[PDB]
Design a protein around this ligand. Structure first.
Ligand SMILES: Nc1ncnc2c1ncn2[C@@H]1O[C@H](COP(=O)(O)O)[C@@H](OP(=O)(O)O)[C@H]1OP(=O)(O)O
Length: 180
């Protein structure tokens, strides 16, 4: 009744803010997942959850935690992964940066930056922050320099994801150059 809604809501917020990948979910750039996919993910822990139950959680949430648009759902705040909540485009940046561990560099040079268990990749306007973000993934980080105008001309819109972080669907190898 009351504890039911709270325990399901706690899982909902964790999934939507923190680790959609632990449930096989891939949010779009605005942080939405489909309502059906979220229900199926909740159902693995609480089999009694239905779409109507999730809708009532959203409608009755005292803090504005969630938003349903059409048949997709997101958390409105508190994300620990890069999102562009208002879909606001970065049009001014000329160069973006991504740090790749030297071990992962062969596949990235051939294929570019491809999204993995996510719908988009993340890069930075700042080369030092790009290298620090890459260091989290392994040693001997190699700096990739990304031509933002090449990305836009190729049809990839670049979105602001807070401070110096940007997200984009993928980065083709043609928009990438190496640096020490
Ligand atoms: N009823 C509910 N529905 C969803 N989520 C809930 C929740 N009741 C609590 N949470 C979240 O638990 C985290 C620690 O909260 P406390 O123990 O400090 O109160 C924090 O989430 P996070 O770790 O992402 O910041 C809270 O979310 P919120 O701040 O929205 O209540």
């Amino acid at each position: 009744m009351k504890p039911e809604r709270k325990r399901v809501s706690k899982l909902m917020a964790y999934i939507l803010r923190h680790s959609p990948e632990e449930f096989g979910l891939r949010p779009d750039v605005e942080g939405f997942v489909s309502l059906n996919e979220l229900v199926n993910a909740l159902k693995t822990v609480y089999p009694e959850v239905t779409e109507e139950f999730v809708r009532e959680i959203v409608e009755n949430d005292p803090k504005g935690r969630y938003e349903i648009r059409g048949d997709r759902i997101r958390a409105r705040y508190g994300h620990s992964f890069p999102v562009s909540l208002d879909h606001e485009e970065d049009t001014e940046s000329r160069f973006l940066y991504h740090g790749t561990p030297r071990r992962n560099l062969p596949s990235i040079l051939k294929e570019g930056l491809k999204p993995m268990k996510r719908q988009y990749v993340h890069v930075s306007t700042d080369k030092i922050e790009a290298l620090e973000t890459g260091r989290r993934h392994g040693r001997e980080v190699v700096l990739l320099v990304i031509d933002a105008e090449c990305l836009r001309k190729r049809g990839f819109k670049i979105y602001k994801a807070g401070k110096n972080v940007r997200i984009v669907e993928r980065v083709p190898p043609d928009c990438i150059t190496l640096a020490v």
